[PDB]
Amino acid sequence: MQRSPLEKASVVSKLFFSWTRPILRKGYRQRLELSDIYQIPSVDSADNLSEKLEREWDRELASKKNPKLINALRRCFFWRFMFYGIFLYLGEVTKAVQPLLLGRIIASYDPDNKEERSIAIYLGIGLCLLFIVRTLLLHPAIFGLHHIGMQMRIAMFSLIYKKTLKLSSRVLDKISIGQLVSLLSNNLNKFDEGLALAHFVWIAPLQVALLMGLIWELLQASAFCGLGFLIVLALFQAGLGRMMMKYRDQRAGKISERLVITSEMIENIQSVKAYCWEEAMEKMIENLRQTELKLTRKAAYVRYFNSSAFFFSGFFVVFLSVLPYALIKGIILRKIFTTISFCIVLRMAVTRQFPWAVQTWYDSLGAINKIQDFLQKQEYKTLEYNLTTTEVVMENVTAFWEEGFGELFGTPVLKDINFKIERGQLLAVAGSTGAGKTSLLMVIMGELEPSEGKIKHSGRISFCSQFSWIMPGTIKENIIFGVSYDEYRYRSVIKACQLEEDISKFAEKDNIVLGEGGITLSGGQRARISLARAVYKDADLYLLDSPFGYLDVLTEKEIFESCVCKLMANKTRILVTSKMEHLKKADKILILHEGSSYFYGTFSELQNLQTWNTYLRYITVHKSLIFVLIWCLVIFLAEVAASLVVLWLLGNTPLNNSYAVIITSTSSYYVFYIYVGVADTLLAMGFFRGLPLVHTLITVSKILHHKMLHSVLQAPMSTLNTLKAGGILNRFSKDIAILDDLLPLTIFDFIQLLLIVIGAIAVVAVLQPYIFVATVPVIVAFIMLRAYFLQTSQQLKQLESEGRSPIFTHLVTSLKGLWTLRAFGRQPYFETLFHKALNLHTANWFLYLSTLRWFQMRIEMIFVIFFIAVTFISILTTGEGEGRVGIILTLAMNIMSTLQWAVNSSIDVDSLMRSVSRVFKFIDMPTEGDIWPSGGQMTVKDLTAKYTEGGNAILENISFSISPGQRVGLLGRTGSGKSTLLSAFLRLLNTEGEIQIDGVSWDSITLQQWRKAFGVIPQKVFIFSGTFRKNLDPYEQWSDQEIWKVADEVGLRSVIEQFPGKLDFVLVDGGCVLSHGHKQLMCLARSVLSKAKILLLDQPSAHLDPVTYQIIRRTLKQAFADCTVILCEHRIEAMLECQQFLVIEENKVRQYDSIQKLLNERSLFRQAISPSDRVKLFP
């Protein structure tokens, strides 16, 4: 990491921006190098800006009665804000005095021997000094304001991330990820570039006042008559402004809902492919875009008029100003031209510098109000009493989930519970699915607050959750979790939890980079990592929320008899389980039922009791766009043609005529200048040209989004495991929102300005030849410098754009596994780990932003250097009568001002066109590519299974056969590959060989027609945000009578009726409202509905007790009558059902007929069988 070159630089280097020079010549030749990226300055790091504003915000909360975040921002930015403002004012004031000096220098060409001839050279010196001071005065202040804006945004982002870690469990149901992602995604680049525009609120009026006097000098009455039009027009723009911000708050609700559905489906696509929900998910996201794009088009139509009230305004402000003066006194051309030159600045001042400033003040204060509202929310309170005898006591506790019933006090999830726990003994928390075993642990931790009751234990606590959580990094970084490493401790934990088997099979033994959630690992490997993280942590109380769900009986007994009773057996460790073997060794038991203590005591008592290609693939998506652009061009040619014959007639005039005074001298070199100043309205796009162009460009972004979401869904599994969660979420959030909002209007201004310059040069050139030759040296200079800059700029804009993914990826896992962070107390780790993501983004963004003003300053310096050269060549070579050299040259240099503005607009288009480039990389991803399943007999031959292309083979030379309508058991040790065998049939991972069914093979049929044969219950359950009927069938094939008919057999009768809207209750936060057992029953009903003659069950019973498991065999015997069943399951009770058994080990299979034979070979596995389950197998 090289340190920032801004730190050690002369004022000249910081004034002329020479310190950014190295990376351009480095980036021009070569591809950009990671070494060449500079470390952020010490001023604008995450830590200090957090430090600074954190200190002010609590001072603000302490002092005032109703605090405001703007007051906290004021005390740390206001002086450095206003310091740049006064330079930006003087830099803008010097534009208004330019027509006074230049005006006379144009007038001095007139042969009528005026006094100007005399002063011209002094204006010549003065006007050169005038340009030099502005070029220096403006750009440092803009960079200064961008630099302050960047510091404000980093400070607020840091305060949101600290606030969200202390946020209440009550609030998490209300605020989804789409709320947080959208808030950051909106502000990320909009807030920084805004503070350049923000000052023109108070610059523009003083500018209007200063200009109105200078016009009042020329025209006494009419100038006010003109101004009235701009007051008339300014109120119309303010009307569009308030209209456009009411269309944006209707849409803002819709965007959040789209991101939560898009995130959820791509996070667990492996289920989405198994069920075959492509059309279902696409049609769902399609319906959310309908409302969004309706509001986008409406907000875009009002935005055009706001950005089209400057070009049209031009002609009418001058016309209404000169007309009244013309009728009474008469006018000289020298008076009309002067007015034109003042007018252009005034409109710039009042029609694109005033409506862009206020619009920035609304958005900034709106964004700050949402952040301030987000900071003032219900916090997770902590109340831990270190002083204790280490006796975990609970007495007379009740608890409700929601606020309403709890506050008004629906049945509470706990009531009338009480227990006493000495230090060095484990509690056996037992009961049926929906007893409140997770809820009890949530009360012990303090996530769920009890209405009536009291809890007390010491602050130190460990927590192994039911849904296992894996942060992004190495298995080591997961197991130790933000603390020092201890060789003796870490190794002893891994042998206790016995991951030694699973860790040794990996290529990189200890440390492999796991993704967001850890889908590289199976269910058993995640559970034991979560348990290892819990065990490696040291605390007074260990909470274990059923870690033996996904484990086989051999692993379950060894890990129980190796960790729970060996590694920790001198402390209070409440556990969740439902087996006799675990309750025997346990000292105290608590059997919950319907949120009530059925029993409490001991085991003995209980028995007693009972680039060109990017710019070309974006124009040829939609045919309307190419018709509209051709339609604009033919109308453009017509007005260029119309103006040419107007100026032909006007110039060729043979001229009491007070109306407009002209002489042979003045005529020739004012008539052309008048046209150049009024060529911004004549060659303007109307509501015939501008409307459809905006309409089509939004239609392009709708088509691009459809293709992108379509391509991501049907791409192969390897390409989707390669990329992160935040990388997916970044594009659909930020990159698709740029094609909807900014990019359609950014192209409009670029085309408008480009047409004005082309058409201006065209009419001037055809009528007077040498001005085209005069423009060419300045034209080539701008194109030269532009081509040079874009080589570095395009490479910085990709490192910066892809630099966003760290911030989002981190924000997902932070919010996803929030309960474990506060359990272990690892906020200081995650805050400092989050600061690195901001510093990374700042490092790239600051670099790109600073490179731009270099370009912005250099192109103005080029224009100044040429204008200085033109002015003295003009003034010095002026004849005794009628100097023609200056007449030709200054006309060109009036055009180059409009082109300078167009080149700056061109760089804003290329920066936004990067986004469309990054969308097209997702569109260009590879594709995975009588009655048929009558009986459902499978024949596998020479099968091989591996995830990565040319990696390690998980299964090797697999072959076996199932006869029709036969139930088949599948089993083996955790991490054997059982899922891989189920994924091999669906062929989600790439395989070799053939699996032929009912005498017909893979290659005979398409893949989507193939996957409709099977009926899947996956290991990881997927419940998207919607109604129960939407989850149970997205296609809406089955009736309510049908779904209610299924709902009783699998037993969601009592589950659904609990909630208000029966089959209309909108599930949230990935179905957090339902318990873990109900999610397994949800996937069962989903498979029961889909009548399939083959069906695949990946551990249907995960954390179901023996009572709930009767439903599984009830529905498996009755509903699945004739169809063949592959049952992948750990519990031995399930083996009584199915005939043939498939055992997996050593990357190969073995098939067995009877159970007696199979269990006979293996002794340790037969000795793991429960005594209650041993009397069933053997009679």
Ligand X SMILES: Nc1ncnc2c1ncn2[C@@H]1O[C@H](COP(=O)(O)OP(=O)(O)OP(=O)(O)O)[C@@H](O)[C@H]1O
Ligand Y SMILES: CC(C)CCC[C@@H](C)[C@H]1CC[C@H]2[C@@H]3CC=C4C[C@@H](O)CC[C@]4(C)[C@H]3CC[C@]12C
Ligand Z SMILES: CC1(C)Cc2c(sc(NC(=O)c3cc[nH]n3)c2C(N)=O)C(C)(C)O1
Residues of span 640-679 touching ligand Z by CB under 6 A: none
**231 scored as a contact of ligand Z (CB under 6 A):** no
820 marked as binding residue: no
Consult the annotation and say whether 803 binds a ligand: no
Which of residues 582 and 978 has its CB atom nearest to Mg ion in the complex? Answer: 978
Question: Quick check: 189 and 741 in contact, CB under 8 A?
Answer: no
Where are the extended beta strands (E) located within 400-477?
Answer: 414-421, 427-430, 452-456, 461-464
8 Å CB contact between 464 and 603:
no
913, 612 contact by CB (below 8 A): no
Residue 686 interacts with which of ligand Z, Mg ion, ligand X, none, CB < 5 to 8 Å by class: ligand Z
Q: Tell whether residue 86 is a contact of ligand Y (CB under 6 A).
A: no
Interatomic CA distance for residues 562 and 573, integer angstroms: 15
In angstroms, give the least distance from the CB of 225 to ligand Z. 16
401 contributes a contact to ligand X by CB under 6 A? yes
DSSP state of 601: E
Query: Which 679-698 residues touch ligand Z, going by CB under 6 A?
Result: 686-687
Q: What is the smallest separation between the CB atom of 439 and ligand X, expressed in angstroms?
A: 3
CB of 983 to ligand X, least distance (A): 7
Whether 245 and 362 have beta carbons less than 8 Å apart is answered as: yes
Q: Which of 15, 129, 205, 213 binds ligand Y (CB under 6 A)?
A: 213
Task: Count, in order, helices (H) and strands (E) of the chain.
Answer: 50, 18
The token pair that represents 1050 in the structure block = 């699998």
Is 935 labeled as ligand-binding? no
Stretch that binds ligand Y, among 155-163, 212-220, 494-502, 929-937 (CB under 6 A): 212-220
Residue 947 assigned as binding residue: yes
According to the binding rule CB under 6 A, does residue 354 interact with ligand Z? no
- 209 is a site residue for ligand Y (CB under 6 A): yes
**Amino acid residing at 442:** M
217 is a contact residue toward ligand Y (CB under 6 A):
yes
According to the binding rule CB under 6 A, does residue 319 interact with ligand Z?
A: no
Distance CA 131, CA 98 (A): 9
Looking at residue 20, the DSSP 8-state letter turns out to be T
438 among annotated binding-site residues: yes
Q: Output phi, psi for 1140, to 5 deg.
A: -75, 145
**Contact map string, positions 160 to 199, toward ligand Y, x by CB under 6 A:** ----------------------------------------
927 is in an annotated binding site: no
What, of Mg ion, ligand X, ligand Z, none, does residue 85 touch, CB below 5 to 8 Å by kind?
none
Residue 523 in the binding site for ligand X (CB under 6 A): yes
CB nearer to ligand X: pick between 446 and 977: 977
Contact criterion met (CB below 8 Å) for 1164 and 574? no
CB 938 within 8 A of CB 1002: no
977 annotated to a ligand binding site: yes
Q: Is 126 annotated as a binding residue?
A: no
When binding is defined by CB under 5 A, the residue of 437, 705, 810, 1079 that contacts Mg ion is 437
Contact between 980 and ligand X by CB under 6 A: the answer reads yes
User: Which partner, ligand Z, ligand X, ligand Y, none, binds residue 803 by CB below 5 to 8 Å per kind?
Assistant: none
Minimum distance from residue 909 beta carbon to ligand Z (Å): 21
The answer to the question of residue 979 lying near Mg ion (CB under 5 A) is yes
Q: Does 221 bind ligand Y (CB under 6 A)?
A: no
For 801, phi then psi, to 5°, come to: -60, -45
Closest approach, Cβ 711 to ligand X, in A, equals 21
Which residue's structure tokens are 């949230």? 1068
Q: Which span (202-210, 257-265, 281-289, 621-629) binds ligand Y, by CB under 6 A?
A: 202-210
Name which of 305 and 467 has its Cβ closer to ligand Z. 305
Report the residue from 550, 675, 848, 922 that binds ligand X according to the rule CB under 6 A: 550
Position among 308, 746, 851, 1087 found at the interface with ligand Z (CB under 6 A): 308
Q: Does 1072 bind ligand X (CB under 6 A)?
A: yes
Q: Is 1066 in the site for ligand Y (CB under 6 A)?
A: no
Amino acid at 860: E
Alpha helices in 1001-1126 (DSSP H): 1007-1011, 1028-1032, 1040-1050, 1053-1057, 1076-1089, 1109-1118
Give 960's strand partners: 940
Q: Confirm or reject binding of residue 351 to ligand Z (CB under 6 A).
A: no
List the single partner that 976 binds among Mg ion, ligand X, ligand Y, none, CB under 5 to 8 Å by kind. ligand X
User: Can you say how many angstroms the Cα of residue 670 is from the centroid of all Cα atoms in its chain?
Assistant: 54
Q: Say which amino acid occupies 1081.
A: L
Q: How far is the CB of 524 from Mg ion (least distance, A)?
A: 7
Per the annotation, does 1156 bind a ligand?
no
**308 or 522: CB nearest ligand Z:** 308
Closer of 305 and 536 to ligand Z (Cβ): 305
Amino acid symbol at 518? G
Please identify, using beta-carbon distances, which residue of 526 and 858 lies nearer to ligand X. 526
Q: Is 436 annotated as a binding residue?
A: yes
Residue 534 CA to residue 461 CA, distance in Å, equals 9
Residue of closest CB approach to ligand Y: 213
Q: CA nearest 1032: which of 1074, 1069, 987, 985?
A: 1074
Site for ligand Y in 554-613 (CB under 6 A): none
Residue 557: what residue type? K
Spatial distance between the Cα atoms of 401 and 393, rounded to a whole number of angstroms: 22
Smallest distance from the beta carbon of 738 to ligand Z, in angstroms? 25
Q: Which residue's beta carbon is nearest to the bound ligand X?
A: 524
Q: Does 321 bind Mg ion (CB under 5 A)?
A: no
What's the CA gap between 250 and 296, in Å, rounded? 10
Does residue 816 interact with ligand X by CB under 6 A?
A: no
* Residue closer to ligand Z, measured from CB, 472 or 744: 744
Question: Would you count residue 199 as binding Mg ion (CB under 5 A)?
Answer: no
Smallest separation, CB 168 to ligand X (Å)? 12
The arrangement of strands across the sheet holding 461-464 comes to 461-464, 541-544, 575-576, 427-430, 588-593, 596-601
Q: Give min distance, CB of 89 to ligand Y, in A.
A: 11
Residue 210 interacts, among ligand Y, Mg ion, ligand X, none and using kind-specific CB cut-offs from 5 to 8 Å, with ligand Y
Question: SS3 for 493?
Answer: helix
Burial of 429 (0-12, 13-18, 19+ CB in 10 A): buried
3-state DSSP percent of the chain in helix, strand and coil, to 5: 60, 10, 30
466 annotated among ligand-binding-site residues: yes
Strand partners, 797: none
Concatenated DSSP letters for 654-722? Answer: ----TTSB--HHHHHTTHHHHHHHTHHHHT---TTTHHHHHHHHHHHHHHHHHHHHHHHHSS-HHHHHS
Nearest to 983 by CA among 957, 932, 946, 938: 946
Residue 502 or residue 735: which is nearer to ligand X going by CB? 502
Q: Which is nearer to Mg ion, 437 or 533 (CB)?
A: 437
Closest CA to 866 of 13, 117, 93, 131: 131
The DSSP call for residue 162 is H
User: Which tokens in the block code for residue 1096?
Assistant: 């695949």
- Total residues binding ligand Z (CB under 6 A): 7
Question: What is d(CA 604, CA 1007) in angstroms, rounded to the nearest whole number?
Answer: 58
Q: Could you say whether residue 313 binds ligand Z (CB under 6 A)?
A: yes
Q: Who contacts 765 (Cβ-Cβ below 8 Å, separation ≥6)?
A: 771, 772
Binding site as annotated, residues for ATP: 401, 431-438, 466, 947, 972-979
Binding site as annotated, residues: 401, 431-438, 466, 947, 972-979
Question: Which residues are near Mg ion by CB under 5 A?
Answer: 437-438, 466, 978-979
Question: Which residues are near ligand Y by CB under 6 A?
Answer: 206, 209-210, 213-214, 217
Question: Which residues are near ligand Z by CB under 6 A?
Answer: 305, 308-309, 312-313, 686-687
Question: Which residues are near ligand X by CB under 6 A?
Answer: 401, 413, 431, 433-439, 466, 502, 519-520, 522-525, 550, 721, 947, 954, 974-980, 1019, 1072-1077, 1103
